[PDB]
Design a protein around this ligand. Sequence first.
Ligand SMILES: [Mg+2]
Lengths: 122, 117, 59, 204, 137
Amino acid sequence: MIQPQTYLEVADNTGARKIMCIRVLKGSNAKYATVGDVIVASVKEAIPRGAVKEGDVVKAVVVRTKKEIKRPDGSAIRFDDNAAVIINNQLEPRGTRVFGPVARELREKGFMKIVSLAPEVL
Amino acid sequence: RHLKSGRKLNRHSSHRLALYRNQAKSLLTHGRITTTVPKAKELRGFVDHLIHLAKRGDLHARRLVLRDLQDVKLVRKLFDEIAPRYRDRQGGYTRVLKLAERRRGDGAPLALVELVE
Amino acid sequence: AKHPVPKKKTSKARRDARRSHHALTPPTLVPCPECKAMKPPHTVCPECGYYAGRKVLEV
Amino acid sequence: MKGILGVKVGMTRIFRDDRAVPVTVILAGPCPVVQRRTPEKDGYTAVQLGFLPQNPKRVNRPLKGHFAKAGVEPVRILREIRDFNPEGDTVTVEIFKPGERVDVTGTSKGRGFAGVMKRWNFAGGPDSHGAHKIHRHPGSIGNRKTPGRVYKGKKMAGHYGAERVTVMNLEVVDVIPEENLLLVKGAVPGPNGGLVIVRETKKA
Amino acid sequence: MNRGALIKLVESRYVRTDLPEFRPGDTVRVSYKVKEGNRTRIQDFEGIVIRIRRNGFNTTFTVRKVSYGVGVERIFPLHSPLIQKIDIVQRGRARRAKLYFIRNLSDREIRRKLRADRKRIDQDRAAERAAKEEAQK
RNA sequence: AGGGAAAGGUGAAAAGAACCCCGGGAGGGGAGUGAAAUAGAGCCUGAAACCGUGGGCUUACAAGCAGUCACGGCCCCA
RNA sequence: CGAAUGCCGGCAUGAGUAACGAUAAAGAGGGUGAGAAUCCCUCUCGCCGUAAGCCCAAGGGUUCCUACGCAAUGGUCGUC
RNA sequence: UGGCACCUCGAUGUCGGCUCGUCGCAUCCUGGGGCUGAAGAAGGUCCCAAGGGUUGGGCUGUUCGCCCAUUAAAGCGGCACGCGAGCUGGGUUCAGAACGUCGUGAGACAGUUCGGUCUCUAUCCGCCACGGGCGCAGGAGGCUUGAGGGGGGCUCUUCCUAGUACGAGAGGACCGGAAGGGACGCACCUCUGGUUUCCCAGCUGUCCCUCCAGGGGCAUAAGCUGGGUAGCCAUGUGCGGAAGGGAUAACCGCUGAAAGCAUCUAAGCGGGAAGCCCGCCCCAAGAUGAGGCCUCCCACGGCGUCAAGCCGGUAAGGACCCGGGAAGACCACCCGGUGGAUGGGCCGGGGGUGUAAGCGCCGCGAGGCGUUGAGCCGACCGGUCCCAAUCGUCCGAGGUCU
Ligand SMILES: [Mg+2]
């Protein structure tokens, strides 16, 4: 469960390596974020050149968590880390790639391109 | 809401354990014992079970009892002389009965614990 | 000696009124069968005793 | 108003269509109507059933065989069902069909003398920095000279639980007529082996 | 009334009795997966089994993969949309019930800690006994 | 260095209660001394606060600086 | 004398209320006695061990040992 | 912010924060409405309306403010600038020290700087909970009626009606219908996930039982480590605000004179809000106005200012003592007491650990193999009279009247 101050790994080549939740973009007072939810972040380390730079204030979508998610079918799924992918205000990846698996909950939330670009959907 | 559960307890683990072990060593040594009701009503099952292990009599059950009682001498008596006297009995190897009158000391109501026959 | 303290002497009347419920209870007793005596029920008692059980003296 | 008496047995979950539904199993055994309330002599309209039948004849004054179906007044007694007047001859489960909606009364588990911040979910005070003797306390309970007293109803600590509680609008998942069974959509008040009554809901 | 239990055991009329008998060894298997306005397509999850937790019906188990960079854990009800369930290597030789222990120092060191259970292998081979006797019996 | 309390009284005469009874004792109950023993021993007289037992009147839909004025009921010598 | 947060003494209220002075820890069976959770004996259990063991100096002044005792002193009981 | 100095100097704790709230409306959102320099969408402005809501961080002791990122909105005030016998003590404000600065000096500065003792026991009122006594004009065992209280009342986005009314287009509705969210409320333990103080294993030091093997204590009040049923729980599950009926606020009308016209009004009649009343959930006849329905038990037996104001046995019933409880501080409440499965044991199943000990075989040895999913096993679902609820005792009408 992701919240303000949580460090996420980034699974795309926008150049940035790690970001940090600033706010979660559900209602007026939403407590936490999970897969398929949209956050604001700031960047905290980057790889040299690339569109995105340390210090930059960005948008992201959550694609993996460490707290298992519960399927309505009555099964569940959990990953070794908390990762995300960097989005533009018109909601597309600004990457041309994504590394490591992703949760199918994305597909129910409309994050199609990410899903098709992904190397695996669990 | 503590207690929706059971197994009653005063003192702390290491001590409480040892109490039952000593009280038992007493019953098996003396056939009848006298204490407070609650101490008695607990000692009940802890002792029944040692009796029942001595019925099946196998080296294992021997070594199993040596853990709580600790005298080799005493355990022989347990297997050899006490166990037989039951054998056909299915449980209830022990009785609790309440005397009249307390210690003029602390007002504590007493009882006695008989090995049954 | 410290913070909270009584404002007024409690009056004789209100003293005793507290004590309406302090009254005592007589112990509950039955006649010892198999011997002439009183004893509290569910008890072994030493003028007498039981049957398939222990008691005082027999010579 | 459809309405049986019954008892919580326990819960688990089943599958449906293609997903797990949580369910809680009620035993709403056969409920022999023993008295009808008329508006002509009682003033109100209702029916008095009975439940757990079993009784080794300890029945004295309320022997009241007086209504034919006196077949041993139940251990778990008898409750009225307000405006409900059937074909007077026992009520089994058949009244409720799967997919119907029900309200369910019950007796919540008992927490006893409960602290505020359970009884009422208060914040209490900090586990560290300043004080140490008020981690779980309520803090303030008033103002000063005006009004110079505490409000009737103030939330403070006290007895919590063991109370009448109706949870509204549960789904009837299933009904085993065979065993006098009733399946509902999870979460019904009190412990196992507790009396509950089960009615129609009020929905839309 | 009396069996608050056996009543519940009665509603459990959805039990399964066909799926391979396995424990903290090395299964692998299939699924259900919806999308695309269809309910169809089976997906396979191959991995080490970390935990089995028993409770009559509704007992569950969980399986551990490394997908690409990342490791993964999945949790299964042991009942319903699991078509097949065949298993890779009944090795295990686990010395304990839960072995989450592996997550932290999982690599090639896993392998020396989880060798093959020759014993339980030797009786999956020897459980071959298919009565070969057709037009022969 | 120095500071510095509390605490008097049986009876004319000990005649200071032999002996018996309940109690481990302490106490009591009979008996006996004395004009008197609620003069029995930190005992003359023994006031007040304070604590008991017994008896008459009185109170569980009321509300008060606790009293006063007026009727009315009950209880005791007219 | 009714008042001086007056002085001396006596008895009330709070009240059967807070407390009973290290969280090293107890159990049973025999004695003795008018009376025993609290004394004596035995068997289990726990705590200290550069000590919670042993030997001197200071200070204390019979607390040492024994026989008879239990009103009081002992934070309960007490035959100790 | 001040003026005045009336109670308080044999004491009325003083800024800011936290905890817990409650009330005002002069309304920040959401609900009705009138104008508009209202095409639509989006505003402006005033009227009715608190029922509920009114985010998270950076700086500073801060109140306040500025700033980051969001929101339907990030409302203004009162309650001793609410709340220190409820907590804090960063700020002004005791004693130490220094800088600037004024003073010959001792010393001084809401100027700066670093430091600096916040009290176990609630008598009355009040509040949250729980019992005892009497009453309810016969004495009982049950089931109810609801006078009158309390709880709850929020809100967004996307799809469809349609990119159609409107349109200088460059955008975009009313009315009506669906689907997901956010917080908050009651209850629950199937699932997910915690705890699980001795339920099961593994390990080190040391002392011991008995030399090997096997075990016990101590290393916490669990030595350490790896797991972990029941219960209790939130990060987990299910439900909830509502439909609906009646009366209204601003406001919009019908019919209609005074006043031959016109007017919502002066006689009458209709519409009309997240608001009012009732409806939903909970408490409730000490509602001394003590209610109602079903069923039971009835005899004067012996004496006064003759129906208890009488004592002693009854009746239907009820206590006492006992075995227990997802009930519980005590009490109360519920269930049982041999005509019995209430607790304990014992037997089966669930559940947890994860192949006991002993023997045999392989290795010089540490060890390894088989026997074996073995051995041990709290709470959960049940069975079975082996142990224990033995035997008994005490209350309790005999019911004045038109
Ligand atoms: Mg100054």
